């Protein structure tokens, strides 16, 4: 497994940690679709819109099993800590046309 999860469930946008690396979700898109971070960094998605969304990494990306994140409602957030270098593609489960990637160096 190449990621650890600070919080299995979503939490309010206001509760996002100081210093967070943030990807907003708005207008049916990941607003930073190509994010560059370092091994060990935590990325936090924040959903800005009324339509709930998640992040979903297919099997073979963060590990052997898919990682289907929980749905973030409006003004909710979710974090993943990347523990290995690589380019990690993801999508929103019911909106697979929404795609993004985290490049971990
Ligand atoms: Co969605």
Curated annotation (Swiss-Prot):
Residues 1-105 form the Plastocyanin-like domain. GO terms for cellular component: periplasmic space. The keyword Transport applies. It comes from the Bacteria. Pathway: One-carbon metabolism; methylamine degradation. Its main location: periplasm. Its cofactor is Cu cation. Binds 1 copper ion per subunit. This is Amicyanin. The gene is mauC.
